Design a protein around this ligand. Structure first.
Ligand SMILES: [Mg+2]
Lengths: 191, 193
């Protein structure tokens, strides 16, 4: 069955739960209640892979509710960084259109390196990889140029819900992002 | 079964419950115990769609009890705004007449844009949409001109009760206003046996 808009208050895992999933201290988080994009990317095809919880993906006449969080090792320390975004749509079709704004608009991003101009006047360079998106599930990775830092991303469309999770770290945040997306999905009350 | 007048004391969802329903912080609320109208509209057929809990709808010889609340994100922040009004009438027919003061007097409002003059001296321009009212359920939407802000409204007649709920936000407050109206109805003690 479809989710009520209230599920966003429950579907975002708090920093304690995030710490238990990544296997590292997570002492800082910031919650958000609206989609936001805090950067511009040079290559437009990579916009909807460059972060999650984006306005062009989620903002829609049929967006009923939205919540997310960014969690980190500590204030000023993103050694581990974890982000979550959950949108509840009025219809299953609207959630499908939001899913397709992620996966249709990023065809050609895989294999590209591009500059992210952050709104705080920092510039980062990221290399994107990812296989073809599924009907309701899309994974991709970005790696920061000259580092072993990779962000593992997953997007999940479940009935009238679109959710996204991102785990950034050295090594492989993929296992953690899959455990986290599972934990988020388990709250949706869709049976 | 009709509701006793006392149900208005617990039919209005507090800000904590409203927050759980809309899925966003709701830190501010103001309760009221009398119908009020804090505006005028240029086009009179849109009066009873322009807000809920109105005197011309609820005030009546057979109004037994009345309560409502307005709730917001925070004191000066209406990013989410939610309003509720519950009237208990002495008779089911009096509740039906109150329902018809909403739905009869707003025929022609759908498709109209009109100015709302607020008591605080501000002017807002709203575009009204809505299908024909049902026998006991009337829904409509108003959109603020030049914005994605929409207020989803539901008016429901249940035995001797008229209830109204309004959820204002960007995107679609429709699912939340339906959950909220359901939560309000669940307190009315109307299950027949
Ligand atoms: Mg009876």
């Amino acid at each position: 069955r479809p989710s009520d808009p209230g599920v966003v208050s429950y579907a975002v895992m708090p920093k304690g739960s995030v710490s238990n999933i990544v296997g590292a201290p997570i002492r800082w988080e910031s919650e958000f209640t609206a989609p936001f994009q805090a950067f511009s990317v040079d290559n437009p095809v990579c916009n909807n892979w460059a972060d999650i919880g984006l306005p062009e993906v989620f903002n829609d006449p049929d967006l009923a509710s939205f919540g997310g969080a960014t969690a980190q090792t500590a204030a000023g320390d993103a050694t581990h960084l974890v982000k979550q975004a959950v949108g509840v749509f009025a219809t299953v079709d609207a959630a499908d259109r939001a899913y397709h704004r992620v996966v249709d608009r990023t065809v050609g991003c895989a294999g590209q390196t591009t500059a992210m101009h952050l709104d705080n006047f920092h510039t980062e360079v990221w290399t994107f990889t990812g296989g073809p998106a599924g009907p309701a599930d899309a994974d991709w990775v970005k790696q920061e140029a000259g580092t072993d830092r990779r962000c593992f991303n997953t997007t999940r469309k479940r009935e009238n819900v679109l959710l996204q999770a991102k785990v950034c770290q050295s090594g492989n945040g993929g296992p953690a992002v899959n455990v986290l997306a599972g934990a988020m999905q388990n709250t949706l009350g869709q049976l």
